[PDB]
C-alpha cells in the first residue's frame, strides 16, 4: 500500500549530521579554490616560473581587465600582450565559467583573495567601477578592499550581532554596480533583478569551507574592515542600508 | 425542429450534484500520481539493489537544496556530489520539469514523500534558497520550517473546521511568494497577486489531491506541531495568513 | 453614363425586410448549434452509447478543464483520461475554433445550454473563476448560471425594459475575468481592451436563431434569472453596473 | 551653358490653371469608381445575373461583414456562404487595396453610395458600431447615412459656409470609432494620430470627381442631410465641434 | 624612427589651396545638378520631346506625389499614370537615392529649382504639408517658395548679417515637418534627432557650386524672400527663431 | 597534502608595492591601436606600391576630417574623381571601418597617428568640418582653437603638466568633443552632457596617456601651434572653454 509506505517516512530517521553532510556535497560550487591553488603552484613550478609573482600579475590583470584573456590581448600594448600570453599558456587560462578544474583569472583572484584585498587599495581609480564612483553612491568612503567579487570569500556570516550579514549587504552595493558595468544590459533592470545575477555564486563563496572562520576574522581585522573587538567600520552599516533600500 | 426541442429538453434532464462532483474529481487537474511515484521509486530502487529509502532522502535533500533540474545542477557541483547525482538519475530515470504522470522528478519525490520532507526541513533551513532567517523577517515571527517548501501544500486539508485550512494555505502562500521570486527572478518586479497566479493552480491541485486522507493530514499536522490535538493552529499561522492576505489582495 | 447608372440607385428599392433577411444569413456565425445536436446524437447513437449522458460529461469537462481535450489528458488521472479518450473518439472532438461542422466541448456547452446552466449551480467552486471570486467582484451573490460563455445563448436582447442589454452587461462582468484566465496575455490590458475579445462571438450567441425568444424567457425564468413578471433579479443590475463602470 | 539653362527657368511660365490641371490628374486615387460600375454591370450581365440585386447584397455584406470576403466565409452560415461564393466568382472579388481595375466590397459601397446610404438606415443595429451607440455619443442622434466611410465620397468640401468642412468633421466622429473597432493596434491610441489613419483616403474620396457638385448636393438633400437651401442639420455641429474637440 | 617621422609632419606643407581642392573632391555629393540638367535635355531631345514641359511636369509630380515613380502609378488615374509611364521611360527615372548619374524626380526639382520655387505658390494646398499648416506652426505666413527641400540649393550662407543662416533655419522648420510626414517613424523622435536626417544633404545643396552667389541673390529677390537691399522678410526671422528653439539652437 | 589554505593565507603578507602594481596596470591597460604600427604600416604599405605615401597621409587625413571613418560608405555620395582616389587609398592601405585590431589601418587612426599634420590642416578647413568653427565660436563665446577641433588632439595632451594646465586642456577639448559626438551619434542628441562625456572618456584618456609621443615631443607641438607661448604659457581662450565644459558636466 503506497499511501501507507509514504506515511511511514514520518518516522524515518532524519539525522541532521547526515543531512548536512549531504548538503555540502550537493551544494552549488562554481569551483574549488583548493584546486586552483594547487594547479597554479604545480603548473608554475613545472615551467620554473616565479609563480607567486604570476598570481599577482594575473590578479591585477583581472581587476583591471576582466575575465576574458584572449579578448583582452586584442586591445593591449604588445608588451603587455606578450606577458599575458605566457600566463594563458602556462596556467592554461580560460574565460567565463568552465569546469571545476579550469583556471580563470577571476578564479585566481578569488582563491588568492588575501592578496587581492591588498592590491585593491592601490588601484581603485583604475577599476571598472572607481573608488570615487562608489563613494558618491555610498555617501561615504566605500572600503576599497570590497571592490571586487572575491571579497565574498572573506565574509563570515556567523559573526556576532549580524555583522556578517551587514558585510554582505554592504558588499552587495558594489556588486550591483559592478554587474551593471560589467554587463550593459542589466542597466535597464531593477536592482532586485540584478542581484539575482550574483546571489548564488556569492553566497557560495561566503559559505565555502576553504578558509576557516578564524582565518576570516584575521583578514577582516588586518584589512581594517573590523577592529580587534570585531566592530565594523561605520561606513559599512551605512552602505548595507542603502543596498537594502535598493532591493528590499 | 427536432434538434431545437432536443436541446430544450435538457432543462428537464437530471443534474445530480453528487454525480457531477464525482465527475469533477475524476476530470480534475493532476500533475502526477503520487501513488505511481512511490511505486516506481521502490521498484526501481529494488531493481538495482539500492537502499531505495535512503535514496528518497537524498533526492529530497538535493531537491530542497538545488531544485528540479538534475543535469544542470551537476555542472556547479562537487565531483563527489555529481557522482551521486549521476547514480540517482540513472536509477530512477529522473527528468526535469513537468512531464507525464508516470515520470519521476526531484520535486515529485519531495511531494510524494512529504512526511519526510517536512522533517528534513527543520534541519537545513539555512541552506534553502530562501532561508528561515529570511522567512522570519518577512513573517515578523518564527516562520514554521515545515512549511518551507511547495510540498507542504499536499498536506493541507482545506476542510478543516473554523477555516483553519484556508488559513494554512494563506500562511503557506507567504513562503510561496518568496520562493517563486527567488526561483524565478523575472517575478521580482511583479505585484504579489501576479506572483500568486503562478502557483495557485498547482498548489490547489496538491491540496485537493486524494493521495493522503483527511485523517492522515490531521495526523501529520499535529505531529509536526502545526496544530495541537485540538486542531488549533500555531499562533504564527494566523500572523502569516494575515500578511499574505494583505499582500495579494483580500 | 456610369455616373448616371450609379445615381439611379438612389431610386432603387431598399426593402428593409429583405435587407434584414440578408443580414441574418450573412451574419457572423461561429458554428451551427443545430448541427452539433444532430451530430452528437447521431455519432453517439452510431456506437450505441448513452449519448445524453455523454453530453453531460462533456459539459462538465468543459466547465472544469476547458476546450483543449488532448492537453487536458496530459494532466489528468488515468481514469478520467480514459473517459475523455472515448469521447474524443466517439464525437470526433476538436480543439479551439474550427469549422461550423466540427464538435468541440465548448460547442456542446453552448448547444446544450439548458443543461449547462443547471450544472453550474452545483460546481461553482470547481470553476476556473470560482463563485466566491465573482461574489467579491460583484459586491453581491453573482448568479451561478451565468458563469460560462454559453449563457449568452440564452439572452434575449428584446426583453422589455431593456432587461436584455442589462443581462449582457452583467454577463460581461464574468466574461472579463474568464478571459483573463483563459488568456493570461490579457491580464495587462484594459477592460475595454479585453471586452473586444469576446464581443463578436458573444453577440452572435445572443442573436442566433436556434432558440426562440419564447424559449429563452422560459429558460431565464426557470433558472431564476427573471420572475414570471419578467423582472430581473435585483442583483443583476449591480453587476451590470460594475461592468459598465469598468469598460466605460 | 547648363547653369544658364536652369536659371532660364526663372522666366519660364508657371500657369496656375495648367499646374492645377496637372495636380488633379496626378493626385492620389484609391480606385476608379467608374470602372467598378462598369465591371460590375458587365461581369454580372455575362453570367446572366440580376447584377443590380447583387450590388445590393455586396453592399450589405460589406456593411455587415467588412472587406475580406474569403475570411468571412469561415464564420458564416452555409446558405450565406454559398451566396458569397457566387459573388466572388462572378465579380472576381478581392480584399484589401488592390489595383485600379479590381473590385472589392468597399469599392462597391463606394461606387454605389446612393444605395448604400439608404441601406444604412434599415440595418443600423447590425453595424460594427451601432446607431444607438453612435447616437449616445452625440446627444442628438447620429445620421445613419453617415455611418460608413463611404459617405465621404458624397461630400462637397467647397460648399458655402464651410458646411462641407463641417460635414467632414462630423464624419470624422464616426470615422474614429469605426477605425477603432476595425482594428487595434489602436483602440487605445490617441485621436490626434488615429485621424492620421484615414485622412488621406477619406480626403481622396471627398475630392473625387466621379460625382458632380450638383450630384452631391442633390444626394445630401435627398437624404435629409441638407435642406433645399443647403442648410446643414442642427445635429451636425455637435459632432463636428465634438469631433474637433478630440 | 617612427615617432620622429610622425613628428616631421609638423613641418610638412599644408598648402591651403591643395587642401581645399581635395575637400571639394571629397565632399558629400548626392548628385551633380549639372549632370541632371544635361541628361534631361539630352534624353528628352533624343526622343523629340518638349523636355522643358516634361521638366515642369516632373516637378509638379514630385511636389505632389514624392519620389517613388513606380509606386505612385499604382494609386493614380489611368490618364495620369500614362503620363508618368511615359516620363519614366524617356528619362530613365528611378526612386530614392541612386548614383550621381541617375535621374529622380527629387533631383529634377533640385536642378531646376528656379521653376520649382514659382510652382509652389500655385499648388500649396496640394502639398504633403500644406501652407495653412505651416502657418499654424509658424504663427505666420510661411513662404511658399520655401516649402520644399529643393529650396536649400538656393540659399547662400554668405549673406551678410547672417541672413543665410537665418534662412537656413527658417527652412529647417519646414524640413522637420516634411520629414515627419514623409517618414512615419520620425514622429516619435525629437526634432534634433530629426534634423540629423536632413542636415548633410541640405548642407551639400547649400554649399553646392552650380549656382553663383550672385545667381542666388537674384533668385531670392525675384521670389520675394529678400529685397533689393538684401533684407529678409520679417517672417523669416520668426520661423528660424522657432526652429532653433525646437532644435535648441 | 601541500596545504593550500596556508599557501593562500600567506599572501596576506606578500608584497603589494603600489608602484609595481601600477606599472603593471599600465602595460595591461586598454589600447585600441598602436600609433607606431600605424605609421609603419602606412610608410611600408605605400612604398610597396610606389606611392607618395606622405601625400597619401595628408589626403587620408583631410578625408577623415571631412567625411569620417567609413570609407566604403563614403564613396556612395562622392564625386567620381574623389571616389576614384578613395578606392586606391582603401586598396593601397587596406583601410577598414570602425575599431579593428592593432594592425589595421583606419582613417581615424591616420589622423591620430599623424597628429602633427592634422592640427595644421584643421586651420585651413574649419568650415568644412562636421561642426564648424564658427559654431564652436558661438558655443565657446570666444574664438575656439581650430587645432583643437578633432578627437585626435587628445594625443597632444600631457596631463602631467604643471598647474593642472594639462587637465584643463582636456576640458577645453571636451567642449568640442560633446558637439562632435552628438553629430556623429544622433541618438546622443537628447542626452545630458555629462551623459555624453561618458561616450568618449576612456578613448580620450587612452589618447592622452599613451607613450608614443614624448612629454617634450608634446610640448613643442603645443607651442608650435600656439596652444602655448614659449613660456609653457597657456592661451586664455582655453580656460574660457574649459570650465564652460566642466560646467555642463555634472
What number of residues does chain F have?
250
Q: Are strands F233-234 and F228-229 parallel, antiparallel or unpaired?
A: antiparallel
Partnered with residue F228 across adjacent β-strands are: F234
Q: Look at residue D246 and give its three-state secondary structure.
A: coil
Q: Do D119 and C6 touch (CB under 8 A)?
A: no
Q: What angle do CA C144, C146, C151 make, to 5 degrees?
A: 145
Q: What angle do CA B238, B241, B246 make, to 5 degrees?
A: 125
Taking one residue from E and the other from F, the number of pairs with CB-CB distance under 8 angstroms is 101
Chains B/A: 3 or more C-beta pairs closer than 8 A?
Answer: yes
Longest dimension (CA), chain C: 74
Judge whether A108 is closer than 8 Å to chain F, CB to CB.
no
- How far apart CA C34 and CA C103 sit, in angstroms, is 11
Nearest to residue C132, comparing CAs of C114, C144, C119, C122?
C144
Nearest to residue F213, comparing CAs of F86, F72, F116, F107?
F116
Q: Look at residue A226 and give its three-state secondary structure.
A: strand
CA A166 to chain centre: 16
Q: Which three cell numbers stand for residue F167?
A: 587637465
Q: Are F227 and F169 in contact (CB under 8 A)?
A: yes
Sign of CA dihedral E234, E235, E236, E240: positive
In whole angstroms, how far apart are CA A129 and each of A60, A146, C90? Answer: 15, 12, 69
- How far apart CA B120 and CA A14 sit, in angstroms, is 6
E231 Rama sector, left if φ>0, alpha if ψ -120 to 50, beta otherwise = beta
- How far apart CA A91 and CA A59 sit, in angstroms, is 13
Judge whether D37 is closer than 8 Å to chain C, CB to CB.
yes
Residue by residue, DSSP assigns D157-223 as TT-GGGHHHHHHHHHHHHHHHHHHHH-TT-SSS-HHHHGGGTHHHHHHHHT-SSS-HHHHHHHHHHT
Q: Look at residue A142 and give its three-state secondary structure.
A: coil
- How far apart CA A133 and CA B246 sit, in angstroms, is 39
Under 8 Å CB-to-CB from E68, ≥6 apart: which residues?
E95, E96
DSSP state of B102: T
- How far apart CA E206 and CA E152 sit, in angstroms, is 5
- How far apart CA B67 and CA B85 sit, in angstroms, is 13
Q: Look at residue B228 and give its three-state secondary structure.
A: coil
For chain E, how big is the Rg over CA atoms in Å? 20
Q: Which three cell numbers stand for residue E129?
A: 504639408
Buried b (16+ CB within 10 A) or exposed e, D29-68: bbbbbbbbbbbbbebbeeeeeebbebbbbbbbbbbbbbbe
- How far apart CA F50 and CA F44 sit, in angstroms, is 10
Q: Are D15 and E60 in contact (CB under 8 A)?
A: no
Longest dimension (CA), chain E: 74
- Least CB–CB distance from B4: residue in C79, C119, C211: C211
For residue C26, the chain D residues in CB contact (below 8 A) are 60-61, 64-65, 76-77, 80, 83-84
Q: Are C175 and C202 in contact (CB under 8 A)?
A: yes
Which of B26, B163, B194 to mutate to test binding with chain C, by most C CBs within 10 Å of its CB?
A: B26
> What is the phi/psi pair of residue D48, to 5°?
75, 15
| Terminal-to-terminal C-alpha distance of chain B | 50
Discontinuities in chain E with C to N beyond 2.5 Å fall right after none
Q: Are A23 and B64 in contact (CB under 8 A)?
A: no
The four Cα atoms F105, F111, F115, F121 give a dihedral, to 10 degrees, of 150
Under 8 Å CB-to-CB from D162, ≥6 apart: which residues?
none
Judge whether F133 is closer than 8 Å to chain E, CB to CB.
no
Under 8 Å CB-to-CB from B109, ≥6 apart: which residues?
B37, B41, B56, B59, B60, B63
Judge whether C96 is closer than 8 Å to chain D, CB to CB.
no
For residue E16, the chain F residues in CB contact (below 8 A) are 124
- How far apart CA C235 and CA E175 sit, in angstroms, is 61
Q: Are E150 and E123 in contact (CB under 8 A)?
A: no
Which of B6, B191, B199 to mutate to test binding with chain C, by most C CBs within 10 Å of its CB?
A: B6
Q: Are E117 and E124 in contact (CB under 8 A)?
A: no
Nearest to residue B106, comparing CAs of B57, B178, B43, B52?
B57
CA F34 to chain centre: 12
Under 8 Å CB-to-CB from E133, ≥6 apart: which residues?
E177
Q: Are E129 and E178 in contact (CB under 8 A)?
A: yes
Under 8 Å CB-to-CB from B96, ≥6 apart: which residues?
B68, B69, B70, B71, B72, B105
Q: Look at residue B16 and give its three-state secondary structure.
A: coil
For residue D184, the chain C residues in CB contact (below 8 A) are 196
Alpha helices in D13-139 (DSSP H): 16-26, 33-46, 51-65, 69-74, 78-91, 105-111, 113-122, 131-136
| Terminal-to-terminal C-alpha distance of chain F | 56
What number of residues does chain C have?
248
Q: Are E183 and E128 in contact (CB under 8 A)?
A: no
Residue by residue, DSSP assigns C149-203 as GGGGGG--TT-GGGHHHHHHHHHHHHHHHHHHHH-GGGGGS-HHHHHHHHHHHHH
Chains B/D: 3 or more C-beta pairs closer than 8 A?
Answer: no
Nearest to residue E126, comparing CAs of D209, D165, D26, D153?
D26
- How far apart CA D211 and CA B121 sit, in angstroms, is 84
For residue C119, the chain B residues in CB contact (below 8 A) are 15, 20
- How far apart CA F227 and CA F217 sit, in angstroms, is 14
- CB atoms under 10 Å from CB of B219, counted, come to 16
Q: Do D55 and C100 touch (CB under 8 A)?
A: no
Buried b (16+ CB within 10 A) or exposed e, E26-56: bbbbbbbbbbbbebbeebbeeeeeebbebbb
| Burial (Cβ within 10 Å: 0-12, 13-18, ≥19) of residue C211 | buried
Q: Which three cell numbers stand for residue E170?
A: 527658417
- How far apart CA D141 and CA D139 sit, in angstroms, is 6
- How far apart CA F122 and CA D192 sit, in angstroms, is 48
- CB atoms under 10 Å from CB of D160, counted, come to 8
Nearest to residue F120, comparing CAs of C141, E13, C191, D177?
E13
Taking one residue from A and the other from B, the number of pairs with CB-CB distance under 8 angstroms is 103
- How far apart CA E175 and CA E180 sit, in angstroms, is 8
Q: Which three cell numbers stand for residue C52?
A: 445524453
Long-range contacts of residues F125-134, Cβ cutoff 8 Å, at least 24 apart: F125/E19, F125/E20, F125/E23, F125/F62, F125/F65, F125/F66, F128/E23, F128/E27, F128/F65, F128/F66, F129/F65, F129/F66, F130/F68, F130/F180, F130/F183, F130/F184, F131/F176, F131/F179, F131/F180, F131/F183
Judge whether E190 is closer than 8 Å to chain F, CB to CB.
yes
| Burial (Cβ within 10 Å: 0-12, 13-18, ≥19) of residue B229 | exposed
Nearest to residue A33, comparing CAs of A223, A222, A209?
A209
- How far apart CA F54 and CA C166 sit, in angstroms, is 88
Give the minimum alpha-carbon distance from A248 to chain F in angstroms, rounded to a whole number.
Answer: 28
- How far apart CA C207 and CA B227 sit, in angstroms, is 56
- How far apart CA A195 and CA A189 sit, in angstroms, is 10
Residue by residue, DSSP assigns A145-198 as GGSSGGGGGG--TT-GGGHHHHHHHHHHHHHHHHHHHHSGGGGGS-HHHHHTTT
- How far apart CA B55 and CA B41 sit, in angstroms, is 9
Q: Do E64 and D23 touch (CB under 8 A)?
A: yes
- How far apart CA F161 and CA F141 sit, in angstroms, is 26
Amino acid at each position: 500500500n503506497y499511501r501507507t509506505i509514504a506515511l511511514a517516512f514520518l518516522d524515518e530517521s532524519a539525522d541532521s549530521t547526515t543531512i548536512n553532510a549531504w548538503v555540502n556535497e550537493f551544494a552549488y560550487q562554481g569551483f574549488d579554490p583548493k584546486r586552483i591553488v594547487q594547479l597554479v603552484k604545480e603548473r608554475g613550478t613545472a615551467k620554473g616560473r616565479d609563480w607567486k609573482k604570476d598570481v599577482k600579475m594575473m590578479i591585477v590583470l583581472n581587476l583591471v581587465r576582466g575575465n576574458k584573456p584572449e579578448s583582452m590581448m586584442k586591445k593591449m600594448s604588445e608588451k603587455g600582450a606578450a606577458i599575458v600570453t605566457q600566463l594563458i599558456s602556462t596556467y592554461q587560462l580560460k574565460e567565463g565559467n568552465p569546469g571545476r578544474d579550469t583556471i580563470t583569472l577571476s578564479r585566481v583572484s578569488a582563491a588568492f583573495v588575501p592578496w587581492t584585498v591588498q592590491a585593491l587599495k592601490t588601484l581603485s581609480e583604475s577599476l571598472p567601477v572607481t573608488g570615487t564612483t562608489m563613494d558618491s553612491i555610498a555617501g561615504t568612503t566605500y572600503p576599497r578592499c570590497m571592490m571586487h567579487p572575491s571579497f565574498a570569500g572573506i565574509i563570515d556570516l556567523e559573526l556576532p550581532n549580524n555583522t556578517g550579514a551587514m558585510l554582505a549587504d554592504a558588499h552587495g552595493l558594489f556588486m550591483l554596480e559592478f554587474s551593471k558595468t560589467i554587463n550593459p544590459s542589466l542597466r535597464t533592470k531593477q536592482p532586485n533583478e540584478i542581484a539575482a545575477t550574483f546571489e548564488k555564486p556569492n553566497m557560495a563563496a561566503m559559505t565555502g569551507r576553504f578558509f576557516t572562520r578564524d582565518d576570516k576574522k584575521k583578514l577582516l581585522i588586518a584589512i581594517g574592515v573590523l577592529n580587534e573587538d570585531l566592530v565594523p567600520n561605520p561606513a559599512i552599516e551605512k552602505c548595507a542600508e542603502k543596498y537594502k533600500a535598493k532591493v528590499g
